[PDB]
Amino acid sequence: EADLALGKAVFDGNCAACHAGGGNNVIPDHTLQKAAIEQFLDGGFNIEAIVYQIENGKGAMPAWDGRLDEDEIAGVAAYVYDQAAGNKW
Ligand code: HEM
Incomplete structure (x- = not known):
């Protein structure tokens, strides 16, 4: 439902x-560490803010809307969340 294996493959x-x-x-x-996201990701440390920046890009980060499907975006967003929240990098 989350799908972290999918998210890691997409990542x-x-x-x-x-x-x-x-x-x-x-x-x-x-960086993709929690405290960095909380400071620099417009929207904060929340899945929708991660999604939004994946979809729409920002600056030197490309946009992924249409190049990744809905399940792929949701899963990579959940993998980034889980890696940050668990201190796993
Ligand atoms: C792949 C789909 C991908 C993901 C996932 C991803 C995530 C991501 C997050 C969550 C942030 C916020 C980090 C923060 O501390 O603010 C972030 C920011 C940047 N990214 Fe990214 N990113 C993905 C892909 C890529 C690729 C392929 C590049 C390099 C060409 C890249 C680069 C950047 C840059 C630059 C930023 C900072 C944007 C800014 O604040 O101006 N990302 N990414």
């Missing part, structure tokens, strides 16, 4: 180019 295939290990190769302080 490794599309997001790890810039965020492997939970970092950010382009803007190094805008």
